[model samples]
Target: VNSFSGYLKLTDNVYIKNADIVEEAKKVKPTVVVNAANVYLKHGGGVAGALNKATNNAMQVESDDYIATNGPLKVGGSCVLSGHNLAKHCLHVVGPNVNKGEDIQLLKSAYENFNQHEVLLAPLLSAGIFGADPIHSLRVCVDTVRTNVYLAVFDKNLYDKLVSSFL
Candidate 1:
């Protein structure tokens, strides 16, 4: 039940949480969220598994719909899904797969692709099941950590200092 804080700047409203992935996704209640999935519609574990299970296997169904056009999704090409969740839109990005290797740019691109949504929920992309270095993954997310997880409601002094520094 430990939730992590996330992100900064004209974009620091992001929050981070530690959970069973899907549990955290529900807590944020975003309009657009990202689901880290591999090619061939695989989601036996990690965030992919969490989203698939939580949304009643809906992600898997939508992912397959993309297979008809080409192979699994390209690294930078985000496939947005409209599904069953608090989120109206879910972006499917290939985070860790043989075809893409460990290009963090693609991960960042995946996250960056979705803009202007009120509450965009996403995991620490590739830090867990994707075999990415935890610190590196966190840093790559830049505005994606240590801001919301403390779940803090600071007093005036702390709030001004913390908020003003980031601002």
Candidate 2:
């Protein structure tokens, strides 16, 4: 699959919750990305299980899948566990969960680490993941980062279409 600097056209029936990140994804050139982290968060399980599910589903439909997340740095953190899947490539980004200053620093670090990398990144919301509103989360994440970040919001219909196409 070709990943552009915007929306990615997938080939399977995938389900996403919030579509707010669509505008941001439109700006990213995704290669083979999946909303596995969101799914795991809403669901449950380690990265292995989540990636296995996504990859298995993708493979069953003969499609390529990539995972992305903004999980915390700790061992049990959402991102770390979910990022460990060996089935597909995973992109992990650390956002500002708390401490605005620390969040900004982490955002900068994430941007610098992934810019030249081939992996696709999900849009990070500084406050939303924790307790901040969407606007505040977006502002804090974007203001602190230096590189061009792409946000991928959940779109049930789009995911369905993409997933169905491959199936």
Candidate 3:
């Protein structure tokens, strides 16, 4: 997977709930999900915690000695965790906190951190538990919102697609 720019053919996997990811796996194919992490890469809340279950406590490794190895992680910094149930690569990204009152600029850089991968799986970003508006959080991260490259989409449309399938 290559091309980490807006030109890559991206698509959204918008679901009603976080657990809906299970349905997406059965209905669609597999992927490289970029799980959201906090400043210290802790997996205490939101998708990060769920991802811990999905990746078999991979987040634990990320959390342990965080300030020692990779401390002070901001919104844009990210890393990759090996193995996954629904995805092959669980990419960890630090999304902005909702209490920060919609960090549009924060998410802009954070979302772009995953640009190079040809295939990726992520959430509605700050729109989820972080609670930023979908458009406000993701529009600038991709090319357009017209269903082809990283915009709001249904689960079926993303079946057998390529690069950044956000379900």
Best by lDDT: 1
Task: Report lDDT per candidate.
Answer: 0.56, 0.36, 0.54
Error of 3 at 34 (Å): 0.8
Residue 65 CA error for candidate 2 (Å)? 20
In what order do the candidates fall by lDDT, top score first?
1, 3, 2
Candidate 3 error regions (>4 Å):
1-19, 22-31, 65-67, 144-167
Which lDDT tens digits does candidate 1 get at residues 1-167? 32233433324444433334465557655556667767666667777787888988877777777687666766655676774684677766666442347576666665554453434566656656677654454555555332322221112353344345432
lDDT of 2 by residue, 1-167 (tens): 33333344331211122344323233332442323233223322322134345444432222112232332242112232222223133443344445333434443444343344344445433334433344443444344434333445444554444334432
Better of 2 and 3 by lDDT: 3
Q: Cα RMSD (Å) between model 3 and the true structure?
A: 7.6
> TM-score for all predictions?
0.67, 0.37, 0.63
Scored by lDDT, model 3 comes in at 0.54
Give the TM-score comparing model 2 with the true structure, all chains together: 0.37
TM-score winner among the candidates?
1
**Higher-scoring candidate on lDDT, 1 or 3:** 1
Candidate 1 has what TM-score? 0.67
Q: State the lDDT of candidate 3 residue by residue for 44-112, as single tens digits.
A: 766667667655675577466654676666676677665356566666777777776646667767776
Residue 156's lDDT in candidate 3: 31
